[PDB]
Amino acid sequence: YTVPSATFSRSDELAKLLRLHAG
Numbered sequence: 001y002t003v004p005s006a007t008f009s010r011s012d013e014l015a016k017l018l019r020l021h022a023g
Contacts, residue, residue: 001008008014 001010001013003014008017
């Protein structure tokens with residue numbers, strides 16, 4: 001992954017973290 005300083009795992013992580021805590 002790449003978003004800013006956020007290379008996560010693959011497809012579970014961006015949808016797990018933004019569905020739990022948006023901003």
